[PDB]
From Swiss-Prot, chains A, B, C, D, E, F:
Protein name: Cytotoxin 1
Subunit description: Monomer in solution; Homodimer and oligomer in the presence of negatively charged lipids forming a pore with a size ranging between 20 and 30 angstroms.
Domain of life: Eukaryota
GO molecular function, one term: toxin activity
UniProt family annotation: Belongs to the three-finger toxin family. Short-chain subfamily. Type IA cytotoxin sub-subfamily.
Organism, as annotated: Naja pallida
Compartments (UniProt record): Secreted; Target cell membrane
One BP term from GO: killing of cells of another organism
Amino acid sequence: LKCNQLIPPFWKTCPKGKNLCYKMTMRAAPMVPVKRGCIDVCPKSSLLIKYMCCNTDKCN
Amino acid sequence: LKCNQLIPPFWKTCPKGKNLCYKMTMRAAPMVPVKRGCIDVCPKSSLLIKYMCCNTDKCN
Amino acid sequence: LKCNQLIPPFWKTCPKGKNLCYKMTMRAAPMVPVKRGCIDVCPKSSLLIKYMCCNTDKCN
Amino acid sequence: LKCNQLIPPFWKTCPKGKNLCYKMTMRAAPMVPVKRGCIDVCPKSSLLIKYMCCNTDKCN
Amino acid sequence: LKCNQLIPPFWKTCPKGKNLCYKMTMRAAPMVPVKRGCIDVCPKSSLLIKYMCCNTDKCN
Amino acid sequence: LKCNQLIPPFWKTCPKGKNLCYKMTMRAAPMVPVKRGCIDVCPKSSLLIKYMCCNTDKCN
Ligand SMILES: [Cl-]
Ligand SMILES: [Cl-]
Ligand SMILES: [Cl-]
Ligand SMILES: [Cl-]
Ligand SMILES: [Cl-]
Ligand SMILES: [Cl-]
Ligand SMILES: [Cl-]
Ligand SMILES: [Cl-]
Ligand SMILES: [Cl-]
Ligand SMILES: [Cl-]
Ligand SMILES: [Cl-]
Ligand SMILES: [Cl-]
Ligand SMILES: [Cl-]
Ligand SMILES: [Cl-]
Ligand SMILES: [Cl-]
Ligand SMILES: [Cl-]
Ligand SMILES: [Cl-]
Ligand SMILES: [Cl-]
Ligand SMILES: [Cl-]
Ligand SMILES: [Cl-]
Ligand SMILES: [Cl-]
Ligand SMILES: [Cl-]
Ligand SMILES: [Cl-]
Ligand SMILES: [Cl-]
Ligand SMILES: [Cl-]
Ligand SMILES: [Cl-]
Ligand SMILES: [Cl-]
Ligand SMILES: [Cl-]
């Protein structure tokens, strides 16, 4: 699995065990990602914060 | 299949016969979705109204 | 004059020359306005879009 | 007064009436600005959201 | 003079004799401030410990 | 093993080979740790930095 990240080169390969791509944003400002990378379990979203997780190459 | 929605808790399980997730927005205003949920047939887009459809959990 | 908006901080002071607040809604999705802001002339409503205008702080 | 903004050219001149530069961030992620520009009054911060305001050229 | 601090409500008014605001961080960890408040003399930095000092409201 | 961290989401699963959780604190600012994470060997404390290590989920 390959996922997008914030800084150049903008992509990376995930380690064994981290099999999800994720993106964190402010729910009120969906166009600016704050964190972007590989993870093992999807974190809990809240009213103000959203975590999106997916498992297809460069889906995040 | 689970899809994102506008009302708390912000997700729902789709009923029998809806096998896609979707999002509806106005051209040049991508940060304000006006419709978000489960659907049967993906609608056709026009100059002002844009639709996106997908088939994995909370992809919309 | 100060009007409501859909993007943070959810309020805005209008420039001199814009003395009305407004709301814009698409007929295809009547429960969710696509824009809230300041304007100089209230636009005529059409077959696809409805407009509502008012003149006091946070009326829209 | 001149202030920084998010997209290229990364700077701009403020209108008359907007005499403060601002930056909005998630309190837990101080290195990624979500919004950046000119404003008239500083918005209220909260536990999760911080607004920083200043009035010297390119202070934000 | 008002300065930012780590404890809620996240700001304080400085007492007589403290005419500067400051922030203390470790090199390569700018997102975790370990000290933040009002001060008299700005301390000298070293290889691992970095200090910044300023003189306008909530500049730190 | 799962350890606490200072950056969102405030928890992390350690890679195979890292079987301890730790906390790092500078003697110049004893009330605020600068880092929390996973490690393989607990480092010796020095004149400037103190280290604490433990072996169970979210102990650090
Ligand atoms: Cl593994
Ligand atoms: Cl979103
Ligand atoms: Cl990552
Ligand atoms: Cl990784
Ligand atoms: Cl399901
Ligand atoms: Cl449905
Ligand atoms: Cl057609
Ligand atoms: Cl077009
Ligand atoms: Cl066009
Ligand atoms: Cl006003
Ligand atoms: Cl305008
Ligand atoms: Cl609304
Ligand atoms: Cl407007
Ligand atoms: Cl306007
Ligand atoms: Cl003016
Ligand atoms: Cl900050
Ligand atoms: Cl602006
Ligand atoms: Cl402006
Ligand atoms: Cl003061
Ligand atoms: Cl003090
Ligand atoms: Cl010296
Ligand atoms: Cl160095
Ligand atoms: Cl070095
Ligand atoms: Cl574990
Ligand atoms: Cl590692
Ligand atoms: Cl702590
Ligand atoms: Cl770590
Ligand atoms: Cl690690």
